[PDB]
Ligand binder design. Structure first.
Ligand SMILES: Nc1nc2c(ncn2[C@@H]2O[C@H](COP(=O)(O)OP(=O)(O)OP(=O)(O)O)[C@@H](O)[C@H]2O)c(=O)[nH]1
Ligand SMILES: Nc1nc2c(ncn2[C@@H]2O[C@H](COP(=O)(O)OP(=O)(O)O)[C@@H](O)[C@H]2O)c(=O)[nH]1
Ligand SMILES: [Mg+2]
Ligand SMILES: [Mg+2]
Lengths: 244, 427, 430
């Protein structure tokens, strides 16, 4: 039934996603050739976009347990995965209206990010999503973007100035968005940028271009932060850090 | 010299039609822009093409093409250049936040560009005359946005307002108190002088004096255009009183926040016994039934009073009538005011629309008085505002269009302060 | 804010939708061939809202959806069935079995992509899309299930446009199934969070009107859909005829919806005419006003005496004294001030249209955002819990993928909606 993962009827597809979730949790760790879902990542990239919201949720939780299963040497093939998987995760996982479907998609983006060497080859893919029609999508993936900075942070990224400027470009547009949640989640992203740098920087670059009522809020938010000006430690480590 | 008129929203655009129609009638300009007079003072409102065509220094802005389309189709389609008629596709739906934040920001650069064109065709630009409504999304939201941008670019020049105070008789929206408070707050520090026009006052004057059981917008706009003409006539004709926009503040604005004069026009006679004297039309300017903002000046104190006569008016007849009124009525001045009336006379007769609802008069007068009693209009808005905002009704519409809810509180705190400032200057 | 895309889903959706297009195509002088045979020019002033061109005549901007091809053919075989676009008929051949889950999750989701393609097609030929309009039944399977899915799908593809619905309520007096409270509860749970405005069309009210007012012993669906098509023509009058008040969908929603979740309207109109030819009452303006604000003319089983009106939209049609209308509309307010919210000044708005509906000279349509509408949800919530306590018939929804928690949430959110409608029914001005 491995090929029924793309069967017409939804219930057969829903079953294969559960069967897959069992395989990735009940298989070998050295792994079967049957677990050839690395080298053809378009398989799960197709499952995440399941036209049935129920079986789509099971394809994501199966992708999640697969994604932590692959945390076994030597799978440096995680570069091909992020390109093929997190655009489907962002476009129809974070955008999803189901709280469970979205919660696991954010959990898969976290795993695919710590499989990387830095956060840049993950930010660049979900940066285009910041300019989508659906506000709930840009509301959700600016919160995700803010939580991949809160935990991972800017380390080992090639040119931080090209990455800082790239993520600071839409921030004035996002903080004037019509949606109340898009604005609210952008104010939280500014706090995360504030926590890694100082206050001097984003006043030079950003805070002047916000509504005065908004930069008063950020001032109140900066006062409520007690930790040191930059966090003396990453709340979450990459895979290559937990090794050597 | 030159003055650029800006007309925002349906109210601003439709009133600008009645005004520029009356301007052309007074100056003898035809709909095609041609005038028969060989061998401005009216060039302050019109420009001259090399082919002898006289074009208004006006800009018409709307977030919906419906109203301005009628302009580039009716009688005055050739009067304006099509670059002066700016429209969007999606309007603001009686929402300030749509006109100021969401929709209006996608046309603000286009409007300022077409204005810079007119401003660059002028040698000595005096300033701007903004026409808009208080209740509409475009007339409240986009106008306050434009006023913020004009103070940045054309910072030195003056800006005058002709705002349309809402009234339930013709109210097309429930949230009109919200929009009124929001635009009055964000425009207060950018406007040098603001002439409010209570639609209820114009509505009742049309019912009472013109015997129109149910006035249309055309009735209200033609009556309003009569007053706006009397105010701008000092700029279009060489006179003594109010010869430039800076003189409106000098004669009517003692403090930057108290820049809301009260206009009272007379006579308004239906087109169906005999001519009124100078003393009778001057007496009518102190009858609150002839005001354009419903309030009782007898319950307030004056800070300025200017009589803008036009027609067959002799100065000695004016001073005779003034001396009678000053010693037969109750005009309370603040004890720090020059207490003296200013009088301007324009010997051209008051022009009306041919075949219209107003009869031609030998003489007329428009009184511009800055009284504290106009704060009663702010109280009627602040009350309707407070009733709905205490429940946060209709607030989600504004928050869903880029507005932070705290901006409601800020705007109401300002109107609270403005009411205190009128109370203080009052006593 | 010009063109409106119309959608009808399910059995009831295509029934009342086809009757609605028959009514307005006549009022706009459009024969089934699509040609214009009218007289006045007001009928063509704002015809671009609901119709398109063919330059070879006018074509409705409507999309017809159903999981069962049975209603597809009964519509095309109807008198105006030849005017709709052939490509705009999107029909599956399976069915929904009066199951909300089958239409929303299972077999409606495998058809909804075909509908969004037709939705996208009609939206590109729009100079400026105003909003959407959906007719459906909350107690069924396709209109309820797939309809709310279509709403949520349009919501995520057109987050700028207004979502308006004409949802009819199930009732034991004219019921086809026992799981209608389940479907209606699951559907209301969607409308409260997805639609900008929703006209509650209670079948229990429509039945009581046909029975106790029109004096019909056995009312048929045609007897009920006559009141629906009349009510729908009235509440859309300001949208297709050149009016000043409540011209587009948003301006109406900005005046009628003070709080986002309280967008459920109680429509009514007068006079109540039967399916006969015409009456000779020739109602006066004071009569049209008394009849409008009367519970016997409400299309929703709720007594306005039991709740307060947050906002009100009245629409008069026909040549009459507009001055006499203001005196009556002002009278009913200051004579029944307890039933109108004080903390919303000027909450009642009255519009006038010179053109009456075909068959009458004077009519008046009422749109009210009353707190009494909680009686309707209380009624549905009662029947829902009566079965859900024992989990009767639940296997058909769980068998299609639904978790049991979805029922608890929909029930909870509906009771929250009832409590909020009671919340502002108790708020004062003080
Ligand atoms: N006197 C007068 N008042 C008008 C006229 N048109 C609109 N108003 C007033 O304007 C208010 C509504 O704002 P509008 O100008 O119609 O709306 P808008 O500026 O076009 O902005 P939108 O909301 O996007 O349509 C109401 O209080 C009306 O009384 C007019 O022609 N004459
Ligand atoms: N007023 C009215 N109600 C209907 C009509 N057809 C069905 N209904 C109601 O809709 C419910 C059944 O849903 P239905 O539309 O038949 O199933 P669907 O096709 O899956 O949406 C029942 O409660 C009926 O009372 C109709 O023509 N008129
Ligand atoms: Mg407009
Ligand atoms: Mg059925």
């Amino acid at each position: 039934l491995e090929q029924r993962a793309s069967h017409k009827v939804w219930k057969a597809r829903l079953n294969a996603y559960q069967e897959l979730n069992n395989l990735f949790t009940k298989s070998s760790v050295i792994p079967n050739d049957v677990a050839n879902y690395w080298l053809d990542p378009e398989l799960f990239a197709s499952y995440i976009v399941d036209s049935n919201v129920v079986a789509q949720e099971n394809a994501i939780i199966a992708l999640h347990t697969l994604l932590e299963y692959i945390s076994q040497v030597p799978n440096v093939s995680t570069s091909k995965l992020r390109l093929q998987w997190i655009p489907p995760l962002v476009e129809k996982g974070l955008s999803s209206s189901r709280a469970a479907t979205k919660a696991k998609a954010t959990d898969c983006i976290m795993l695919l990010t710590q499989s990387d060497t830095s956060i840049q080859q993950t930010v660049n893919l979900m940066l285009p999503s910041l300019s989508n029609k659906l506000p709930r999508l840009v509301s959700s993936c600016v919160k995700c973007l803010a939580t991949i900075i809160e935990e991972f942070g800017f380390i080992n990224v090639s040119d931080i100035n090209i990455l800082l400027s790239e993520i600071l470009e839409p921030l004035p547009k996002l903080s004037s968005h019509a949606d109340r949640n898009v604005r609210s989640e952008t104010m939280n992203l500014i706090l995360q940028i504030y926590k890694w740098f100082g206050k001097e920087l984003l006043q030079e670059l950003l805070l002047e271009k916000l509504k005065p009522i908004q930069q008063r809020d950020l001032s109140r938010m900066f006062e409520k932060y007690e930790g040191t000006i930059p966090p003396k430690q990453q709340p979450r480590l990459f895979q290559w850090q937990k090794e050597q | 010299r030159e003055c650029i008129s800006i007309h925002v929203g349906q109210a601003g655009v439709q009133i600008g039609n009645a005004c520029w129609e009356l301007y052309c009638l007074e100056h003898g300009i035809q709909p095609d822009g041609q005038m028969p007079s060989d061998k401005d003072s009216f060039n302050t409102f019109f420009s001259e093409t090399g082919a002898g065509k006289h074009v208004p220094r006006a800009v018409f802005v709307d977030l919906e093409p419906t109203v301005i389309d009628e302009v580039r189709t009716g009688t005055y389609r050739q009067l304006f250049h099509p670059e002066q008629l700016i429209t969007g596709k999606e309007d603001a739906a009686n929402n300030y936040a749509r006109g100021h934040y969401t929709i209006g920001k996608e046309i603000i650069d286009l409007v300022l560009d077409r204005i810079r064109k007119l401003a660059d065709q002028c040698t000595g630009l005096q300033g701007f005359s903004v026409f808009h409504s208080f209740g509409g999304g475009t007339g409240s939201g986009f106008t306050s946005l434009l006023m913020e941008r004009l103070s940045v670019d054309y910072g030195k020049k003056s800006k005058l307002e002709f705002s349309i105070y809402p009234a339930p008789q013709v109210s097309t929206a429930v949230v009109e108190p919200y929009n009124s408070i929001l635009t009055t707050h964000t425009t207060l520090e950018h406007s040098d002088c603001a002439f409010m026009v209570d639609n209820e006052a114009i509505y009742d004057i049309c019912r009472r004096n013109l015997d129109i059981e149910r006035p249309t917008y055309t009735n209200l706009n033609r009556l309003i255009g009569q007053i706006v003409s009397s105010i701008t006539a000092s700029l279009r004709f060489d006179g003594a009183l109010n010869v430039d926009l800076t003189e409106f503040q000098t004669n009517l604005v003692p403090y930057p926040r108290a820049h809301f004069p009260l206009a009272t026009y007379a006579p308004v006679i239906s087109a169906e016994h005999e001519q009124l004297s100078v003393a009778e039309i001057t007496n009518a300017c102190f009858e609150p039934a002839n005001q354009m903002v419903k309030c009782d000046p007898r319950h307030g104190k004056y800070m300025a009073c200017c009589l803008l006569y036009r027609g067959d008016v002799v100065p000695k007849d004016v001073n005779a009538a003034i001396a009678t009124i000053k010693t037969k009525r109750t005009i309370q001045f603040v004890d720090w005011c020059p207490t003296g009336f200013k009088v301007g006379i324009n010997y051209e007769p008051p022009t009306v629309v041919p075949g219209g609802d107003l009869a031609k008069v030998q003489r007329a007068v428009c009184m511009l008085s800055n009284t504290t009693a106009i704060a009663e209009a702010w109280a009627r808005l602040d009350h309707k505002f407070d009733l709905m905002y205490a429940k946060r009704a209709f607030v989600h519409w504004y928050v869903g269009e880029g507005m932070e809810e705290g901006e409601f509180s800020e705007a109401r705190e300002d109107m609270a302060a403005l009411e205190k400032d009128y109370e203080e200057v009052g006593v | 804010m010009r063109e409106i895309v119309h959608i009808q889903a399910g059995q009831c959706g295509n029934q009342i939708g086809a009757k609605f297009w028959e009514v307005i195509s006549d009022e706009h002088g459009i024969d089934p061939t699509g040609s214009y045979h009218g007289d006045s020019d007001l009928q063509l002033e704002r015809i671009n809202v609901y119709y398109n061109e063919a330059a070879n005549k006018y074509v409705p901007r409507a999309i017809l959806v159903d999981l069962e091809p049975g209603t597809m053919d009964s519509v095309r075989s109807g008198p105006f069935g030849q005017i709709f676009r052939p490509d705009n008929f999107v029909f599956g051949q399976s069915g929904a079995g009066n199951n909300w889950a089958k239409g929303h999750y299972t077999e409606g989701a495998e058809l909804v992509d075909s509908v969004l393609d037709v939705v996208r097609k009609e939206s590109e030929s729009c100079d400026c899309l105003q909003g959407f309009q959906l007719t459906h039944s909350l107690g069924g399977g396709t209109g309820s299930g797939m309809g709310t899915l279509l709403i949520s799908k349009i919501r995520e593809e057109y987050p700028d446009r207004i979502m308006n619905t004409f949802s009819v309520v199930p009732s034991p007096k004219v019921s086809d199934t026992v799981v209608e409270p389940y479907n209606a509860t699951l559907s209301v749970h969607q409308l409260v969070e997805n639609t900008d405005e929703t006209y509650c069309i209670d079948n229990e009210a429509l039945y009581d009107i046909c029975f106790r007012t029109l004096k019909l012993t056995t009312p048929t669906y045609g007897d009920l859909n006559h009141l629906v098509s009349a009510t729908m023509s009235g509440v859309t009058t300001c949208l297709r005829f050149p009016g000043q008040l409540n011209a587009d969908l948003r301006k109406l929603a900005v005046n009628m919806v003070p709080f986002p979740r309280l967008h459920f309207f109680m429509p009514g109109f007068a006079p109540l005419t039967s399916r006969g030819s015409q009456q000779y009452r020739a109602l006066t303006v004071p009569e049209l006003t008394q009849q409008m604000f009367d519970a016997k003319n409400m299309m929703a089983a709720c007594d306005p005496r039991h709740g307060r009106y947050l906002t009100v939209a009245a629409v008069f049609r026909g040549r009459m004294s507009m001055k006499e209308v203001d005196e009556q509309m002002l009278n009913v307010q200051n004579k029944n001030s307890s039933y109108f919210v004080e903390w919303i000044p000027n909450n009642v708005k009255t519009a006038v249209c010179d053109i009456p509906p075909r068959g009458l000279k004077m009519s008046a349509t009422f749109i009210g955002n009353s707190t009494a509408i909680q009686e309707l949800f209380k009624r549905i919530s009662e029947q829902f819990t009566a079965m859900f306590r024992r989990k009767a018939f639940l296997h058909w929804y769980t068998g299609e993928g639904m978790d049991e928690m979805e029922f608890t949430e929909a029930e909870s959110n509906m009771n929250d909606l009832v409590s909020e409608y009671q919340q502002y029914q108790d708020a004062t001005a003080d």
